C-alpha cells in the first residue's frame, strides 16, 4: 500500500516535495535514487517521527518525517542532476529486515525554456492476414510526439487492467526532437472477434503541474 507519486516533471530552479505514505506502521522509511548504471543510493532515511538522516548523496535534498505514515523528500533548486527514478521504502525497523518499496516516482528536471508536449496516441487496426495465418490479433498502441522521454502506457480490456499478452517498450525511442513509445497487446482471434470487447490503451503523463491521461479505444470485430 506504500504510496508515492507516479510521475513528476520540474523546471530548473524549482522547489518540489515528494511525499511517501505507508500504511504498515513502520518506523523506518527511506528515499532512494536510481539512475542508469548507478544502482540504488540512499538519499535520506528516517528512524522515526521527526527524525531524519542524510545519505551519501543528500546534497540537493532535505527531508521531513512529519508523522509515522508520511516521509517527505524536498527537492532544493531542481537541477538536471535531480532527474532520476525515486524509490521510497520502509521497514519495521533498521537491521536485517526486508524493505518494502513503492512503485517509484519518475522525476524529470527540464530547462526553463522547454515545454512539455502531450503524446499523440493511436491504436493500429490488427492485420486481417495475421488473424487468418496465426489465429491471433496483435493490437499496437503507439504514443508519439511527446516530451520528455518518460511516459506510461497501459491496457484495459472492458474496464479491467490487462497484462496477459501485453508487451510494452521499457524505454522511449528518440525520434528527432520528440519521443515515441509502443505497446502491443496480442490476443486470440476468438477474443478479437467480439464487437462488445473494448480494448483500451491509456497513456499517462505529466503536464501543467498535474497528472494527465489520454485514452484510446478500439472495439473487436464481428
Amino acid at each position: 500500500e506504500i504510496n508515492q507519486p507516479s510521475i513528476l516533471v520540474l523546471k530548473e530552479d524549482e522547489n518540489a516535495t515528494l511525499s511517501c505514505r505507508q500504511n504498515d506502521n513502520h518506523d523506518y522509511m527511506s528515499w532512494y535514487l536510481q539512475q542508469p548504471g548507478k544502482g540504488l543510493q540512499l538519499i535520506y532515511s528516517s528512524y522515526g517521527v521527526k527524525q531524519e538522516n542524510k545519505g551519501d548523496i543528500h546534497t540537493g535534498y532535505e527531508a521531513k518525517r512529519s508523522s509515522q505514515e508520511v516521509f517527505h523528500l524536498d527537492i532544493i533548486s531542481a537541477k538536471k542532476n535531480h532527474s532520476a527514478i525515486y524509490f521510497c521504502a520502509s521497514s519495521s525497523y533498521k537491521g536485517n529486515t526486508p524493505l518494502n518499496f513503492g512503485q517509484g516516482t519518475r522525476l524529470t528536471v527540464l530547462g526553463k525554456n522547454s515545454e512539455i508536449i502531450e503524446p499523440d496516441v493511436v491504436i493500429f487496426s490488427p492485420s486481417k492476414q495475421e488473424i487468418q495465418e496465426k489465429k491471433k490479433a496483435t493490437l499496437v498502441c503507439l504514443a508519439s510526439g511527446f516530451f520528455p522521454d518518460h511516459l506510461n502506457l497501459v491496457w484495459k480490456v472492458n474496464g479491467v487492467k490487462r497484462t496477459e499478452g501485453v508487451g510494452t517498450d521499457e524505454i522511449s525511442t528518440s525520434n528527432g526532437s520528440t519521443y515515441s513509445l509502443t505497446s502491443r497487446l496480442r490476443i486470440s482471434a476468438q477474443e478479437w472477434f467480439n464487437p462488445l470487447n473494448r480494448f483500451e490503451c491509456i497513456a499517462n503523463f505529466f503536464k501543467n503541474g498535474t497528472q494527465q491521461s489520454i485514452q484510446k479505444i478500439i472495439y473487436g470485430d464481428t
Binding site: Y32, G39, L40, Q129, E130, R184
Partner: protein
C-alpha cells in the same frame, strides 16, 4: 563497492547464477531483491551465512565462506522472472545497507519460428503505418536497416497450449517513407502487403 554484472540471459527452464562481489565489505547479512517492470524492488531472500533456499523464484542463495560475495541461483527461470536483481549487503548489524548495481535478467522462451511481417494502419492517423514482425527467432531475425524498431515477448492463451510465447518487433514511419520487411535465416525475404 557492491559489484554485479550489468545483464544476464538464459532460456526458459535453464538455471542461471547471478553473482554479487563486495571485496571491501565482510557482510553481516546479505539480501537480494528483484525489480519487475512497472514495480519497485521486491524482497526475495536474506541470509547471514551458508546456503538458503529461495521460495520464489525457485532457487538458492549461497554466501561465500568469507562473506565477501554471494550468488543467487535461479533453478527454473520463466518469462515472469525477467527482472533486475539487486544484492544488498550490511557490514554490521547496525550500519548502512549498501545495494549492488543490479543485474538485468532476460529469460528467452522456447519458440518454434514462423516469421511473418505485416503492415498496419490506424483510423486515428491515416498517414502513418506500423510494421509488425511476429513469431520469429531473435538471433535469426535481421532488422539491420532499421534503428527505430523495438522488440518484446508476449504470451497468448490458445486452445492447445495454455500459454504460448512469441516475439514481436515493430517500427513505424510516415506512410510514404515506410518499407515493411525483414530477413530471417531459413525463410528468405519477408515483406508486408495490405488487405
Amino acid at each position: 563497492q557492491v559489484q554485479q554484472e550489468p545483464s544476464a540471459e538464459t532460456s526458459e527452464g535453464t538455471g542461471i547464477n547471478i553473482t554479487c562481489s563486495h571485496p571491501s565489505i565482510q557482510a553481516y547479512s546479505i539480501q537480494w531483491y528483484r525489480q519487475l517492470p512497472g514495480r519497485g524492488p521486491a524482497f526475495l531472500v536474506s541470509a547471514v551465512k551458508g546456503s538458503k533456499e529461495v521460495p520464489d523464484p525457485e532457487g538458492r542463495l549461497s554466501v561465500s565462506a568469507d562473506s565477501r560475495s554471494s550468488a543467487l541461483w535461479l533453478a527454473r527461470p520463466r518469462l515472469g522472472d525477467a527482472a533486475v536483481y539487486y544484492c544488498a549487503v550490511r557490514g554490521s548489524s547496525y550500519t548502512k545497507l549498501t545495494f549492488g548495481t543490479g543485474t538485468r535478467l532476460s529469460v528467452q522462451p522456447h519458440i518454434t519460428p514462423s516469421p511473418s511481417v505485416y503492415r498496419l494502419t490506424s483510423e486515428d492517423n491515416k498517414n502513418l503505418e506500423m510494421c509488425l514482425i511476429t513469431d520469429y527467432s531473435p538471433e535469426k531475425l535481421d532488422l539491420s536497416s532499421v534503428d527505430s524498431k523495438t522488440e518484446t515477448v508476449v504470451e497468448v492463451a490458445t486452445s492447445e497450449n495454455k500459454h504460448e510465447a512469441s516475439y514481436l518487433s515493430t517500427y513505424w514511419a510516415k506512410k510514404d517513407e515506410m518499407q515493411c520487411g525483414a530477413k530471417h535465416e531459413g525463410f528468405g525475404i519477408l515483406k508486408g502487403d495490405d488487405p
